[PDB]
Amino acid sequence: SFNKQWYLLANQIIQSLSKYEGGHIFEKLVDAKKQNCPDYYDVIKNPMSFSCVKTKLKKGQYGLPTEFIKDVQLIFDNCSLYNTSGSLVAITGKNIEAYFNNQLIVTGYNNFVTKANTINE
Numbered sequence: 001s002f003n004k005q006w007y008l009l010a011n012q013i014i015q016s017l018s019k020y021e022g023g024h025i026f027e028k029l030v031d032a033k034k035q036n037c038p039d040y041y042d043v044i045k046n047p048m049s050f051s052c053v054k055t056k057l058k059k060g061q062y063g064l065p066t067e068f069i070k071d072v073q074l075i076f077d078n079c080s081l082y083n084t085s086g087s088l089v090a091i092t093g094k095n096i097e098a099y100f101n102n103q104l105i106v107t108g109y110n111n112f113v114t115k116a117n118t119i120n121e
């Protein structure tokens with residue numbers, strides 16, 4: 001069915017991000033002490049990781065395909081907010097964001113978004 005099909009696609013896409021070069025930095029939430037960033041959660045108020053998205057997909061927490069996109073984009077927006085533009089972490093986020101947005105085209109995922117936008121118009 002409709003929702004099962006884009007859930008399957010979303011799981012495929014999130015897994016490709018996890019395997020992308022340097023994608024491990026987005027897998028788990030930042031540990032303020034262990035990653036030497038004591039101020040992280042003072043700056044980042046809506047934290048998000050690949051593993052959070054996988055949990056929402058596993059549990060059935062998304063109702064619309066755009067909710068998946070919003071959460072993944074939030075990871076990259078957190079990245080560019082906290083990290084300085086030239087840094088290894090900021091580079092990695094820009095790389096994976098670019099990859100992610102291309103995958104939404106290549107997999108047809110955006111077409112589920114287009115179909116769902118007309119439904120809830």
Ligand SMILES: Cc1cc(C(N)=O)cc(C)c1-c1[nH]c(C)c2c1CCCCC2=O
Binds near residue numbers: 026040078079082083
């Ligand atoms: C670089 C890094 C390495 C590992 C690891 N297990 O090696 C784990 C994490 C969570 C991270 C990481 N990821 C992000 C999105 C961030 C960090 C910490 C540095 C700056 C703050 C920051 O934004």
Ligand SMILES: [Cl-]
Binds near residue numbers: 025
């Ligand atoms: Cl690393």
